[PDB]
Design a protein around this ligand. Structure first.
Ligand code: A1APF
Ligand code: CL
Ligand code: CL
Length: 282
């Protein structure tokens, strides 16, 4: 581990806590990071169930690039701790957790109160702003979904889970790609497993539909194994109940068969901001 970009944090400065979530490709843990002035900082730690020195050095160069992300709607990586080397990414702790679980909790009496239409649109604007920033830096996210967007203590949404994210043209580091959820994958990416910025636009449309349905799984009544054939026949996500016709037309533009017919994040973000401006206060 040469690390010329100084992204590695001394492992001894990190105290691991409770596991927040576990999956086939890693886990998220609560943690404390001892700062220079002796005061501890509450952080989240993402581990990955993978190795080589060149693979870890390439991993640290990618981490160093993500550490320079400066946008309120994009999570900022604090550093990487190493443990055969086992890397763990250190992130700021997002109080409210992921947006998907938050939408589900909102449908319970004890959870957050009923989310107004305007607040749902504001979550979509936030994600579009974050994706516009990443897209302008030539990043492909490749795993955009409401479960991968986080809520800060001020209720601003930030795009997170950069585990499959890569610059366009860069080497594909990884397997981990082939096991991703089929219901967020663009039709051309199911047929060839190749992603572009237009594949992220498709996933963004799916994420807007998740927000508008308050956390429903995409395509009710359709099984994962039928998805490619379903999309090949021209079928798309149906309009949710109480979803403005204007908002649904923005979602449907994300799922045009030809990726080149789909809009960019800059255009989507402006269309959503204009629609939100045209609505009354809550
Ligand atoms: C119940 N509860 C939970 C909380 C909670 C509170 N606060 C949090 N921050 C989290 C929380 O963190 N939750 C994560 C789960 C999903 C969404 C969110 O994700 C964050 C996140 C960001 C960034 C990464 C990343 C991963 C690899 C990399 C490198 C650079 C290492 N890799 C190298 C390999 N390349 C290959 C490319 O193909 C990709 C990039 C760089 C960043 C990975 C994960 C959870 C509260 N309540
Ligand atoms: Cl549907
Ligand atoms: Cl419909």
């Amino acid at each position: 581990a040469m690390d010329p970009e100084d992204v590695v944090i001394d492992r001894n400065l990190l105290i691991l806590g409770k596991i927040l979530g576990e999956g086939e490709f890693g886990s998220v843990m609560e943690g404390n990071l001892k700062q220079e002035d002796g005061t501890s900082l509450k952080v989240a730690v993402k581990t990955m169930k993978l190795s080589s020195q060149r693979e870890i050095e390439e991993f640290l160069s990618e981490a160093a690039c993500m550490k320079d992300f400066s946008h309120p709607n994009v999570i900022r990586l604090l550093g990487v701790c190493i443990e055969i080397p086992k890397p763990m990414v250190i992130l700021p702790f997002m109080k409210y957790g992921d947006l998907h679980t938050y939408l589900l909790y909102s449908r319970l009496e004890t959870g957050p109160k009923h989310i107004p239409l305007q607040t749902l649109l504001k979550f979509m604007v936030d994600i579009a702003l974050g994706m516009e920033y990443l897209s302008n830096r030539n990043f492909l996210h490749r795993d955009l979904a409401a479960r991968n967007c986080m809520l800060r203590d001020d209720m601003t949404v930030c795009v997170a889970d950069f585990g499959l994210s890569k610059k366009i043209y860069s080497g594909d580091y990884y397997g981990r790609i082939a096991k991703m959820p089929v219901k967020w994958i663009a039709i051309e990416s199911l047929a060839d497993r190749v992603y572009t910025s237009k594949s992220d636009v498709w996933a963004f449309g799916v994420t807007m539909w998740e927000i508008a349905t308050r956390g429903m799984t995409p395509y009710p009544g359709v099984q994962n194994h039928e998805m490619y054939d379903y999309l090949l026949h021209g079928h798309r996500l149906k309009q949710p109940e109480d979803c403005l016709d204007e908002l649904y037309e923005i979602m449907y533009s994300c799922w045009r068969t030809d990726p080149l017919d789909r809009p960019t994040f800059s255009v989507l973000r402006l269309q959503l901001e204009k629609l939100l401006e045209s609505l009354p206060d809550v």
